[PDB]
Design a protein around this motif. Structure first.
Motif, PDB file in Angstrom:
ATOM      1  N   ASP A1283       0.802  -1.216   0.000  1.00  0.00           N
ATOM      2  CA  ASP A1283       0.000   0.000   0.000  1.00  0.00           C
ATOM      3  C   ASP A1283       0.837   1.270   0.000  1.00  0.00           C
ATOM      4  OD1 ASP A1283      -2.569  -0.941  -0.227  1.00  0.00           O
ATOM      5  OD2 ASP A1283      -2.897  -1.111   1.935  1.00  0.00           O
ATOM      6  N   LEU A1284       1.949   1.290   0.735  1.00  0.00           N
ATOM      7  CA  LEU A1284       2.800   2.474   0.749  1.00  0.00           C
ATOM      8  C   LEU A1284       3.505   2.660  -0.586  1.00  0.00           C
ATOM      9  CD1 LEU A1284       4.420   2.792   4.274  1.00  0.00           C
ATOM     10  CD2 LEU A1284       2.847   4.347   3.109  1.00  0.00           C
ATOM     11  N   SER A1285       3.792   1.563  -1.289  1.00  0.00           N
ATOM     12  CA  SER A1285       4.392   1.679  -2.613  1.00  0.00           C
ATOM     13  C   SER A1285       3.443   2.297  -3.631  1.00  0.00           C
ATOM     14  CB  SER A1285       4.862   0.308  -3.101  1.00  0.00           C
ATOM     15  OG  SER A1285       5.887  -0.204  -2.269  1.00  0.00           O
ATOM     16  N   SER A1286       2.144   2.363  -3.325  1.00  0.00           N
ATOM     17  CA  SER A1286       1.163   2.885  -4.269  1.00  0.00           C
ATOM     18  C   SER A1286       0.995   4.397  -4.186  1.00  0.00           C
ATOM     19  CB  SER A1286      -0.191   2.210  -4.047  1.00  0.00           C
ATOM     20  OG  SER A1286      -0.742   2.577  -2.794  1.00  0.00           O
ATOM     21  N   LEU A1287       1.705   5.068  -3.287  1.00  0.00           N
ATOM     22  CA  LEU A1287       1.653   6.518  -3.170  1.00  0.00           C
ATOM     23  C   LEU A1287       2.877   7.149  -3.825  1.00  0.00           C
ATOM     24  CD1 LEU A1287       0.588   6.548   0.569  1.00  0.00           C
ATOM     25  CD2 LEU A1287      -0.918   6.975  -1.374  1.00  0.00           C
ATOM     26  N   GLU A1288       2.836   8.471  -3.962  1.00  0.00           N
ATOM     27  CA  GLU A1288       3.908   9.227  -4.594  1.00  0.00           C
ATOM     28  C   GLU A1288       4.494  10.233  -3.613  1.00  0.00           C
ATOM     29  OE1 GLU A1288       2.353  11.294  -7.950  1.00  0.00           O
ATOM     30  OE2 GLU A1288       1.166  12.711  -6.767  1.00  0.00           O
ATOM     31  N   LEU A1289       5.791  10.491  -3.748  1.00  0.00           N
ATOM     32  CA  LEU A1289       6.512  11.423  -2.892  1.00  0.00           C
ATOM     33  C   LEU A1289       6.974  12.609  -3.728  1.00  0.00           C
ATOM     34  CD1 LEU A1289       7.312  11.616   0.087  1.00  0.00           C
ATOM     35  CD2 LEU A1289       9.559  10.730  -0.545  1.00  0.00           C
ATOM     36  N   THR A1290       6.555  13.809  -3.338  1.00  0.00           N
ATOM     37  CA  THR A1290       6.939  15.039  -4.011  1.00  0.00           C
ATOM     38  C   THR A1290       7.595  15.985  -3.013  1.00  0.00           C
ATOM     39  OG1 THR A1290       4.813  16.140  -3.648  1.00  0.00           O
ATOM     40  CG2 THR A1290       5.038  14.782  -5.626  1.00  0.00           C
TER      41      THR A1290
END
Ligand SMILES: Nc1ncnc2c1ncn2[C@@H]1O[C@H](COP(=O)(O)OP(=O)(O)OP(=O)(O)O)[C@@H](O)[C@H]1O
Ligand SMILES: [Zn+2]
Length: 1935
Positions: A1283-1290
């Motif tokens: 689930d954490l891999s499915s988000l994006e970091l900006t």
RNA sequence: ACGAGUGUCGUACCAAG
RNA sequence: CUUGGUAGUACACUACU
């Protein structure tokens, strides 16, 4: 509105009034009917009542005061003879009450385990060990009672040579998941489990063994204890201890490699090498191996004991291939009160190599060595938990006892530790609990140790170690009184404002209690108090403890019934109250208290929400237990008694719901409801239970009804605010601020004792010293006044039980804040409370109904009418904890009476006294200081104790015999010590409580609780290394409990994108990485802060690396999310979407409130007790509403329409009901109402290690056991990572994270700045330990109000909430809204809401409700994370500012031996006119004290035009003070700068309207009367000048305008009336001669004086007539020379330049010929707030000296005795060859130095003060001497050769070390070394070859030269160079 | 045997023969 | 005595925030 006329009918009131004298009855009657609003004033009745009892109070006070002459001085001294008598009487009583057994084989097992060394030869394979056990059991030689059966067991477990198919069968059984599949004469059912084969064991043998050896199915006297005082028994115990010492202390022959070491060894070693060595020794010995093997064996026995049979046994093993345990058949361990029966078997090669703690049954000779079998042991779950957790407790105890003690041998300590940690029986509790009090009283000056030992102490010794401990206690009690004289007070270094040095001298002389060795006083107190905290809780069996508590309560009530006849007495009769003294004391105390504050009733109504609703009060809507009286048949006992009262126990909120639904309570304000309930409810029922504490005798705890709850709440809140108790503090958990209150009081008495003796003995000691340049000295020394210090640490016996409840009647009747109706109703409640009934628990009734055989004297039977009913009337015993505040107020009144007694008694002797006394619930600490010369000290002590006991008996109280002792320098309030001004606390008690007490809620819950306990211990002064020990032990125990060790079931290393548990957050089952300072100051949030700081350090350009945290965060915009390691991206995603957002719910939230979401992500499900929930009336309504066609969706819609019901749990009846019904859906609120037994929560983690327990549901909706989730820990890790891999970091998210974790809260910014900018300095020794909060903590608090109130205001959108100031809520809500808007929370919530609704097509209430719940929970957690409860700390020094506090805290938590000085590069802390005043009061006095006269003005102008103060430019502040009209306070500044005007001088002269008091010079110490007195008091046409030195006023010059004696005297009387501040009483008398006028002083009041000016004839005439008839006589002090000056004396600017042509001061100018203009001083601790460009003069840096706090002392001795580290701080030569240039700019004025004077008091101590120095004692000379000493010291220290420091061979080593310091990054101990080297090369004149350095790159050379260089011993460089070497070798290893 | 205890207890429970 | 079947809390817990 209406009163309670039923009060004057009550039988209780009828008895109360007839017990009183007729006039007292009347006065009571008119007291009740008094109305404060309808009479002229609020104190008419109280004044009348006080005047009525004034005569009798005076008679009693005088009678008690005159008893100081009838004292004899023979008090209770607990010397050896008295202790022996008490011991003999105790032995007699014990032998009466016990059955003493002298046989040695009747011992119970001290440790339920026998151990043997592991065999290096045998393998550790399970099957091979089983074969070995079988074969050895078969070859037993010899005969006994069970040898045949044991050999049969050996027969029935052999497998022969069929091992392969055996292991195949076992493996297949394990893979598939019962049928006995015989292998070879062994009916194997499972791995290590066997079926009883009747063909291999005889029937008789089997039956006999199973019934007698194990007691399986086999089923009055006195308890049989061993002879503790027998010689033979003690010798046998000593032999047992010696054998254990001999066998267990051998080395393991292994290599210590465990979790604790590999995880925290670096930290623990870098905090204390000794501690690391101690651990390495412990891990190599047999003790640690034995305890680990026993713990693992117990874990295996618990694990395999689930599905047994009636003829099956199991062979559990462990890591030791020689220790096996047979698990005999029993019940399933996870059942009710389930027990486990086992038997340890040990195989050892040679005899006597067996650990026999009284448990071995018999050792036999088998083939190839011997076999040893222990006796069967039956244990329950709770004791098994203690057995499992024993290793950490043992390690902690060992490291607590050995810490910093080279004179204690490790073997003895470890013997005591292992025999104390594995002991799971009451035998050691019955000795540990009383030993504390017994030994503490024994060391005391006066105590009742003999009486306590003889008639209370009762050892319960069923084991040999109990005999050993009893003998140890006897020896310690014998030795305590003869060793009390080995403590000595430290030399006090006081400076009239603070006590720099105080406490007990560290003389390691006191003999250790448990150990052969010597300990200091602090270590002795630790050894006294530490054993209290090893004891386990819940060891009491209900079957016995319940009847014990019942016997106690019933016996006390019977005694009160049939033995107490009279209530009011006057001869201190026990449990009686002096009526008139009580009345007078209440009058005086209430009148005094109602005078300090005015709106008292308003505070009661406001702070307690009396006008608000019932649902808004936390104590009324909580989850605690209550009582219900009624019929509960549906939910043998009932048909036995016709008076049996049915009852049930429910929850508080459930009872409130039931009362609201049944219309008993309405929506009226709570106080009206309570007031009506005072008359509505007339019968009160209470039920008692056992608390389950660690004391040998448990305490009863009473549960009451909800009506009684409201009614008692009313009275307690009325009486609470009258008390001096902090309203934010807990009675159950006293705040640590008391530890500071004690210190302040101790300092106050210390100052009083120092000043009074000096004042009364100055002339006597002068006569003595004049004769020193003989019997006259002896006469003078006997004729002087001596000092005394006493502290009476007492506790009151039966505070709640044996008390007179009738005094609270008078307390309420005299309360003027209450209307007659309110007093009527409250007294009616008090009368009805006196008629309460105690309902016996049904468990007790079942126990008593299975008696048949009757008790000989059954008091319970007698006063229950042979168990005719279960209710007992309790009259005089107000139940434990229901009246804390009222009893505290009465105790304070009693103590005021006692203080009056002491004051009058001492004034009878013409002495001085100062008494302070702290009064908690019942604990007492009264400090007495007495200075006089009449009688001896012993009589004073005797009188003080006699009157203390009498005063306690006066008010119906009675001090304990066990807890009351008197001491000379050991203050003991609630679990806190004050050792003569120096605070002290037992930090180890928190570590032990963290190791032992575990709720087993979950991984994070246990880890957080233990880390919080460690943080509290650090706040209580725990050494850093031991705090690291506790943290590591907590980590290891948490990882072992949930199988988190590397390679176990739930190890998360392989599931997260990290490499070590270090890189994993603790929130996801990692270990914590933070320096101990962050742990101490923040707690549980230090991991995130440290990770962010590491990120900043890793990804910030070198140009801004040394700036503030804000400057480096400003570069986050330049950061890229692409160039980040996967671990950092992982942790940043965690922070963004789980801390600052609710992307993933830890559990199903539907029904949760805003405050029930924790900081955890993976919370295992806990027990949901179905049986507990059915008892709830509201739960039935919840079930009915849930089983409705559309009931639930309507409720969801109602919550959505009123979203404030999520944060606020309800504010009105209907809303409260709807909120409760909603919360019954939480699936976690149901867990809080259930039974969470630590025993079954323990066995859950071992029995079911693969059951899915975690209720994890991903990202926002993307027959079974009681505890069951959906995923296991492994599945939880996998799904969460996916689930954490499915988000994006900006980068924007990174900026938001940095803005709302660090930048938001100033405290976080301050901590980050301290961590980044820290510079470590000189080592110092802890000599002045002091308490302190963090000053100016209001300005560093982001959210002022509580998070709950802030969220309530946010939900209502109203800043003006009911219970808080709207002004602060304005800022709180704007901060919260800014947080909400900046993180994009509300609009994203609307985005998901609209998107889901569009996808589903129709509105879905459940999703919107969940979204709003997540929103409120995130907001609540954001507000919560801002408040950091920084309570008082124990610091090496006193803190005055925030930076000082932080520096002291960081220097106190880096090494165990010493504390360091910490300096910050920049301002960590990143009404304006007040800042300007502070700015110039510092800089002006800084220049005068520390800057030469020539450069003073230049330095001042430089600071004015270039510097800035508190982020404000100095020029702006000077312009501010120029504009202000208070400029006349800074006349010297204006004159030096040139901005003075004639208007300013006119204003200065205009200050003669009120007498202008100017102090021409500052006294060195005004309280001790030191310093040149130069004072001038002037008015209009009058002025005076006074000159003296310390004690004697030389001459006074008076200038007047009309020389007439009447005018002279009038003018002098006017002048002396000014606020000059000079005492005039401490000054010595002077000879009076005719024709002269002398300054005179008089005493008028007790402490008020009047000063006049008279003549010799007048004073003589008045003295000679007053001496004839206390005796107040005219005492002259100083002669005056009267002069006549009629001139205006208009001060003009033209004169000042001429007058000040020779004075270059900046804080003092000659405004006149004899008067001065002065600037008020300011303390140099604030001098750090300045910031500006460096001021380079020669080689020094003034700006750095502005920051160097250690060099700002104005004492010659402190500066001359400093270290060269301060100069390393100062020096910035950049190419200088001589030091003389810099020294010129320093001051050359005389400076203070130190003198010592002994103080005449029973605790002998010498004070060291300040005094004006001679001409050569200057700052510059001290600097020069410091350089000349320390440069040579360092040069020899760093010679590294023989030729000398300057020799090139040494220069090579210096070049190598500087190259290592420069190439390798700068360390925490590297700058000081290289700057010291620079200073010394400057001294040697070879500075050319310091900036000429280069490199000599292989790290092998660096390693070698660092390792091989010698370390100095004598200089202070030893510790710092050692630290530098350790740090540099660690870093080069990291290379 | 062991836990508890100057309060009678725990020392698994039920059914069948 | 042999066989079969059954067993998740000490159902437990206060006042003082
Ligand atoms: N756990 C608690 N529950 C209820 N009240 C408590 C608790 N702890 C402390 N108190 C309060 O503080 C008091 C502390 O009394 P303490 O425990 O010293 O015993 P006591 O009743 O004074 O008798 P004795 O001194 O003879 O043991 C209680 O009487 C009660 O008012
Ligand atoms: Zn230089």
């Amino acid at each position: 509105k209406t009163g309670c006329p039923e009060f004057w009918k009550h039988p209780i009131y009828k008895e109360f009034k007839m017990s009183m004298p007729v006039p007292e009855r009347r006065l009571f009657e008119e007291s009740v009917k008094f109305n404060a609003y309808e009479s002229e004033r609020w104190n008419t009745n109280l004044v009348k009542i006080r005047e009525y009892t004034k005569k009798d109070y005076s008679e009693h006070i005088s009678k008690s005061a005159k008893n100081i002459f009838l004292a004899s001085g023979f008090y209770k001294q607990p010397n050896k003879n008295e202790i022996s008598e008490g011991w003999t009487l105790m032995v007699e009583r014990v032998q009466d009450q016990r059955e003493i057994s002298k046989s040695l084989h009747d011992q119970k097992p001290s440790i339920h385990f026998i151990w043997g060394a592991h065999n290096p030869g045998n393998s550790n394979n399970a099957t091979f060990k089983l074969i070995l056990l079988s074969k050895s059991l078969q070859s037993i030689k010899g005969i006994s009672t069970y040898t045949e059966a044991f050999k049969s067991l050996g027969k029935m477990m052999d497998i022969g040579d069929k091992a392969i198919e055996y292991e195949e069968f076992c493996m297949s059984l394990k893979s598939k998941a019962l049928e006995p599949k015989q292998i070879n004469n062994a009916l194997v059912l499972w791995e290590q489990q066997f079926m009883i084969n009747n063909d291999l064991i005889d029937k008789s043998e089997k039956l006999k063994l199973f019934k007698n050896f194990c007691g399986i199915g086999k089923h009055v006297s006195k308890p049989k204890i061993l002879d503790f005082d027998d010689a033979n028994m003690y010798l046998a115990s000593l032999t047992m201890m010696e054998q254990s010492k001999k066998i267990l202390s051998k080395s393991n022959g292994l290599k210590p490699d465990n979790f604790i070491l590999n995880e925290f060894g670096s930290r623990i070693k870098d905090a204390n090498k000794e501690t690391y060595d101690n651990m390495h020794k412990i891990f190599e010995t047999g003790y640690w191996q034995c305890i680990s093997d026993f713990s693992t064996l117990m874990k295996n026995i618990l694990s395999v004991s689930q599905y047994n049979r009636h003829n099956t046994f199991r062979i559990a093993m462990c890591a030791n291939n020689n220790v096996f345990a047979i698990v005999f058949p029993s019940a399933d361990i996870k059942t009710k009160k389930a027990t486990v029966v086992y038997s340890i078997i040990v195989l050892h090669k040679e005899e006597e190599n067996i650990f026999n703690p009284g448990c071995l049954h018999g050792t036999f000779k088998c083939m190839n060595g011997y076999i040893s079998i222990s006796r069967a042991i039956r244990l329950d779950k709770e004791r098994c938990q203690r057995i499992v957790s024993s290793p950490g407790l043992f390690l902690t105890t060992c490291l607590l006892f050995k810490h910093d003690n080279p004179t204690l041998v490790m073997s003895d300590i470890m013997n005591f530790s292992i025999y104390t940690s594995l002991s799971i029986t009451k035998s050691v509790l019955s000795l540990t609990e009383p030993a504390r009090y017994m030994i503490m009283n024994s060391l005391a000056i006066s105590s009742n140790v003999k009486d306590y030992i003889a008639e209370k102490f009762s050892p319960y010794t069923k084991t040999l170690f109990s005999v050993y401990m009893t003998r140890l206690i006897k020896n310690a009690c014998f030795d305590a009184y003869d060793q009390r004289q080995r403590v000595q007070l430290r030399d006090i270094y006081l400076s009239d404002y603070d006590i720099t040095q105080k406490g007990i001298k560290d003389n390691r002389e006191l003999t250790s209690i448990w150990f052969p060795g010597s300990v200091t006083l602090k270590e002795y107190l630790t050894q006294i108090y530490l054993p209290f905290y090893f004891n386990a809780k819940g060891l009491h069996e209900k079957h016995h403890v319940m009847v014990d508590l019942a016997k106690t309560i019933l016996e006390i009530e019977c005694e009160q019934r049939e033995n107490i006849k009279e209530i009011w007495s006057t001869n201190c009769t026990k449990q009686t109250v002096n009526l008139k003294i009580l009345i007078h004391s209440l009058c005086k105390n209430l009148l005094a208290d109602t005078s300090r504050h005015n709106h008292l009733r308003n505070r009661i109504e406001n702070r307690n929400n009396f006008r608000r609703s019932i649902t808004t009060i936390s104590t009324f809507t909580s989850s605690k237990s209550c009582l219900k009286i009624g019929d509960f048949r549906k939910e043998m006992l009932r048909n036995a008694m016709p008076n049996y009262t049915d009852y049930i126990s429910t929850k508080v909120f459930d009872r409130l719901y039931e009362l609201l639904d049944k219309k008993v309570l309405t929506d009226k304000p709570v106080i009206e409801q309570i007031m009506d309930m005072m008359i509505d409810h007339k019968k009160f029922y209470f039920t008692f239970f056992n608390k389950g504490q660690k004391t040998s005798k448990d305490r009863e705890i009473f549960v009451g009804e909800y009506e009684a709850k409201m009614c008692m709440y009313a009275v307690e809140r009325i009486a609470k605010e009258r008390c001096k108790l902090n309203p934010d503090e807990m009675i159950s958990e006293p705040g640590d601020g008391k530890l500071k209150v004690l210190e302040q009081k101790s300092e106050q008495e210390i100052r009083f004792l120092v000043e009074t003796t000096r004042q009364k003995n100055r002339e006597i000691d002068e006569a003595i010293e004049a004769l020193a340049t003989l019997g006259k000295i002896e006469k003078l020394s006997l004729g002087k006044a001596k000092g005394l210090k006493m502290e009476i640490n007492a506790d009151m016996s039966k505070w709640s039980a044996q008390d007179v409840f009738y005094k609270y009647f008078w307390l309420i009747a005299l309360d003027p804040i209450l209307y007659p109706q309110e007093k009527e109703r409250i007294l009616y409640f008090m009368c009805n409370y006196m008629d309460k009934e105690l309902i016996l628990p049904d468990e007790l009734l079942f126990n008593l109904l299975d008696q048949k055989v009757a008790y000989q004297n059954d008091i319970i039977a007698t006063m229950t009418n042979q168990l005719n009913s279960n209710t007992v009337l309790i009259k005089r015993n107000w139940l434990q904890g229901n009246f804390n505040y009222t009893s505290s107020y009465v105790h304070s009144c009693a103590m005021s009476v006692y203080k009056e007694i002491l004051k009058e008694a001492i004034t009878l002797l013409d002495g001085s006294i100062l008494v302070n006394s702290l009064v908690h619930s019942d604990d007492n600490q009264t400090s007495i200081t007495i200075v006089q010369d009449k009688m001896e000290n012993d009589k004073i002590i005797d009188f003080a104790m006699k009157e203390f006991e009498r005063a306690c008996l006066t008010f119906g109280c009675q001090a304990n015999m066990k807890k009351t002792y008197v001491t000379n320098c050991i203050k003991e309030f609630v679990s806190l010590f004050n050792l003569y001004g120096e605070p002290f606390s037992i930090y180890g008690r928190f570590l032990l409580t963290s190791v032992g007490d575990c709720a087993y809620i979950g991984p994070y819950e246990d880890l957080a609780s233990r880390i919080s306990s460690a943080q509290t211990a650090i706040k209580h002064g725990c050494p850093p290394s031991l705090a690291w020990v506790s943290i590591a032990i907590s980590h290891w125990m948490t990882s072992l409990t949930y199988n988190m060790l590397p390679g176990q079931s739930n190890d998360p290393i392989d599931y997260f994108p990290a490499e070590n548990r270090k890189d994993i957050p603790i929130e996801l089952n990692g270990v914590l990485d933070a320096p101990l300072s962050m742990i101490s100051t923040v707690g549980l949030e230090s991991g995130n802060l440290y990770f962010l700081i590491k990120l900043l350090s890793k990804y910030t350009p070198v140009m801004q690396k040394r700036e503030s945290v804000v400057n480096q965060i400003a570069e986050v915009k330049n950061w890229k999310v692409e160039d980040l390691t996967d671990n950092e991206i992982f942790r940043l995603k965690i922070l963004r979407y789980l801390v600052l957002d609710a992307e993933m719910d830890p559990s199903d939230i539907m029904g949760e409130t805003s405050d029930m979401r924790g900081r955890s992500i993976l919370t295992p499900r806990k027990f949901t007790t179905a049986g507990s929930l059915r008892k709830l009336y509201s739960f039935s309504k919840y079930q009915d509403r849930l089983s409705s066609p559309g009931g639930m969706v309507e409720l969801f819609t109602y919550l959505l329409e009123k979203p404030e019901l999520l944060v606020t749990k309800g504010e009105d009846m209907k809303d409260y009901m709807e909120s409760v019904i909603f919360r019954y859906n939480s699936k976690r609120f149901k867990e809080s109402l259930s039974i969470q037994n630590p025993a079954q929560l323990f066995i859950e983690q071992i029995l079911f290690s693969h059951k899915p327990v975690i209720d994890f549901s991903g990202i926002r909706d993307k027959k079974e056991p009681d505890i069951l989730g959906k995923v296991t820990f492994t599945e939880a890790y996998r799904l969460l990572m996916r689930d954490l891999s499915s988000l994006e970091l900006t980068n924007d998210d990174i900026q938001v994270i940095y803005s709302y974790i660090i930048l938001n809260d100033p405290m976080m910014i301050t901590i980050a700045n301290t961590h980044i900018l820290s510079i470590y300095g000189s080592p110092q020794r802890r000599m002045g330990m002091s308490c302190s909060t963090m000053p100016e903590f209001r300005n560093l608090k982001l959210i002022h109000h509580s998070p709950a109130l802030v969220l309530r205001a946010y939900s209502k959108n109203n800043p003006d909430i009911q219970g808080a100031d709207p002004t602060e809520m304005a800022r709180d809500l704007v901060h919260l809204k800014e947080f909400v808007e900046n993180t994009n929370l509300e609009e994203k919530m609307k985005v998901r809401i609209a998107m889901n609704e569009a996808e589903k097509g129709q509105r879905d209430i459940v999703f919107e409700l969940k979204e709003m719940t997540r929103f409120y929970q995130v907001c609540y957690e954001y507000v919560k994370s801002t408040e950091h409860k920084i309570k008082v700390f124990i610091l090496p020094a006193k803190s005055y500012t925030t930076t000082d506090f932080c520096s002291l805290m960081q220097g106190n938590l880096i090494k165990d031996k010493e504390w360091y000085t910490v300096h910050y590069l920049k301002q960590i802390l990143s009404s304006e006119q007040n800042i300007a005043f502070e700015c110039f009061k510092l800089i002006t006095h800084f220049a005068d004290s520390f800057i030469d006269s020539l450069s003073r003005s230049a330095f001042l102008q430089l600071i004015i035009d270039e510097f800035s103060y508190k982020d404000v430019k100095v020029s702006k502040l000077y312009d501010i003070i120029k504009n202000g009209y208070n400029r006349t306070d800074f006349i010297p500044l204006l004159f030096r700068t040139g901005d003075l005007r004639q208007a300013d001088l006119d204003k200065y002269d205009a200050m003669k309207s009120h007498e202008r008091v100017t102090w021409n010079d500052w006294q060195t110490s005004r309280h001790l009367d030191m310093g040149s007195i130069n004072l001038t008091i002037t008015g209009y046409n009058r002025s005076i000048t006074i000159i003296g030195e310390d004690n004697k006023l030389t001459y006074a010059e008076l200038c007047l305008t009309r020389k007439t004696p009447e005018n002279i005297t009038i003018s002098g009387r006017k002048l002396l009336g000014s606020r000059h501040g000079l005492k005039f009483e401490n000054m010595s008398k002077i000879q009076t001669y005719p024709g002269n006028y002398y300054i005179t002083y008089r005493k008028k009041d007790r402490h008020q004086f009047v000063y006049q000016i008279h003549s010799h004839e007048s004073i003589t005439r008045r003295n000679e007539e007053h001496m004839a008839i206390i005796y107040n006589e005219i005492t002259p002090v100083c002669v005056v020379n009267v002069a006549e000056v009629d001139g205006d004396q208009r001060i003009l600017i033209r004169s000042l330049d001429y007058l000040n042509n020779d004075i270059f001061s900046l804080s003092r100018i000659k405004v006149g010929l004899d008067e001065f203009a002065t600037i008020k001083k300011a303390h140099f601790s604030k001098m750090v707030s300045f910031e500006g460009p460096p001021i380079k003069t020669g080689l020094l840096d003034l700006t750095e000296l502005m920051k160097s706090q250690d060099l700002l002392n104005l004492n010659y001795d402190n500066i001359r005795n400093s270290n060269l580290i301060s100069f390393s701080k100062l020096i910035c030569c950049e190419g200088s060859d001589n030091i003389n240039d810099g020294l010129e700019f320093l001051s050359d004025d005389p400076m203070n130095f130190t003198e010592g004077e002994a103080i005449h008091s029973t605790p002998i101590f010498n004070i060291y003060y300040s005094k004006r120095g001679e001409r050569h004692m200057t700052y510059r000379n001290a600097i020069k001497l410091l350089i000349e000493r320390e440069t040579k010291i360092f040069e020899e220290a760093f010679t590294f050769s023989e030729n000398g420091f300057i020799s090139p061979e040494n220069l090579g080593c210096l070049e190598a070390v500087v190259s290592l310091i420069k190439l390798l990054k700068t360390n925490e101990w590297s700058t000081v070394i290289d700057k010291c080297i620079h200073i010394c090369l400057i001294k040697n004149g070879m500075d050319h070859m310091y900036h000429s350095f280069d490199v000599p790159i292989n790290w092998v050379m660096f390693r070698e030269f660092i390792n091989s260089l010698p370390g100095t011993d004598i200089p202070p460089w030893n510790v710092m160079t050692e630290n530098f070497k350790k740090k540099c070798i660690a870093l080069i290893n990291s290379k």
